[PDB]
């Protein structure tokens, strides 16, 4: 079980963050693999990928994702200047994170339509500390736990719609959870 933070494991960047509540076990495995097992967690997000990400990376993932409650499986990352937290959501649990959010378009990529949304976080944790930032979402209609994500299709569609990204910070395949339980085992490349 790993200490919250960032680093490198078996050639891949990882980031694992939680809110301190307890109930999450994040582990790094061989190559691009990571696992998450959680039981009555707080808020958390962790996984493997790259630091920094790029605006045209093709990201592959495969494995198992078994949430019980509020959780997502995504390509997850940040930009700076502007500060943006973004999600290309491939699967989720009890909650579609776009519920009640303003829909900003659609994009077709990697075998599914995705619906695009923007939300905002005010005075919240971020890669630079407490800050205000928009969140950009592409939410896959056809849920899956394996596939490839052509990130450029999302970032280009977001830009077309007026959702600008700054300089890329980290970019991972991640499990997000919010006060839920589950298990997952995911391999990135
Ligand atoms: O020590 C600092 C780290 O703790 C910090 O890590 C980031 C803190 O914000 C995290 O983003 C939240 C993740 O969960 C989502 O549900 C929320 O919307 C976000 O607010 C992010 O994942 C962490 O990387 O980085 C800076 C360090 O100085």
Probe target for ligand 1 pocket from 14, 19, 41, 45, with the most ligand atoms within 8 Å of CB? 45
Going by C-alpha positions, the residue among 133, 140, 131 that lies closest to residue 164 is: 133
User: How many degrees, rounded to 5, is the angle at CA 25 between CA 136 and CA 22?
Assistant: 85
What does DSSP assign to residue 159? H
Taken as a whole, the chain contains a residue count of 189
Say if strands 71-80 and 84-92 run parallel, antiparallel, or are unpaired.
antiparallel
Q: How far apart are CA 71 and CA 40, in angstroms?
A: 12
Listed in sequence order, the residues at least 6 apart from 124 whose beta carbon sits closer than 8 Å to its beta carbon are: 130, 131, 132, 133
Structure tokens at 48: 């493997």
Q: How far is the CA of 120 from the centre of ligand 1 (A)?
A: 15
Q: How far is the CA of 110 from the centre of ligand 1 (A)?
A: 28
Give one word for 127, left, alpha or beta, with left for phi > 0 and alpha for psi -120 to 50: alpha
Q: What are phi and psi of 12, to 5 degrees?
A: -115, 140
Residue range of the domain that includes 162: 1-189
Look at the block and give the residue holding tokens 């045209």: 56
Q: For atom 5 of ligand 1, which residue has the closest CA?
A: 127
Would you say 80 and 169 are in contact if contact means Cβ atoms under 8 Å apart? Answer: yes
Q: How far is the CA of 45 from the centre of ligand 1 (A)?
A: 8
Structure tokens at 125: 């944790």
Structure tokens at 107: 């994009």
175 lines ligand 1 (CB under 6 A): no
Task: Give me the number of domains the chain comprises.
Answer: 1
Structure tokens at 66: 């078994």
3, 99, 179 from 66: Cα distances, Å: 23, 21, 15
């Amino acid at each position: 079980t790993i200490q919250p933070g960032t680093g490198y494991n078996n050639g891949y960047f990882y980031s694992y963050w939680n809110d301190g509540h307890g109930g999450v076990t994040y582990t790094n495995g061989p190559g691009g693999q990571f696992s998450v097992n959680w039981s009555n967690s707080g808020e958390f997000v962790g996984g493997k990928g790259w630091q920094p990400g790029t605006k045209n990376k093709v990201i592959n993932f495969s494995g198992s994702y078994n949430p019980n409650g509020n959780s997502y499986l995504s390509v997850y990352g940040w930009s700076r200047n502007p500060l943006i937290e973004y999600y290309i959501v491939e699967n989720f649990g009890t909650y579609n994170p776009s519920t009640g959010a303003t829909k900003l378009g659609e994009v077709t990529s990697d075998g599914s339509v995705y619906d695009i949304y923007r939300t905002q976080r005010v005075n919240q944790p971020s890669i630079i500390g407490t800050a205000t930032f928009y969140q950009y979402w592409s939410v896959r209609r056809n849920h899956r736990s394996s596939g490839s994500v052509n990130t450029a299709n999302h970032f280009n569609a977001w830009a077309q719609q007026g959702l600008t990204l700054g300089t890329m910070d980290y970019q991972i395949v991640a499990v997000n959870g919010y006060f839920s339980s589950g298990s997952a085992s995911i391999t990135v490349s």
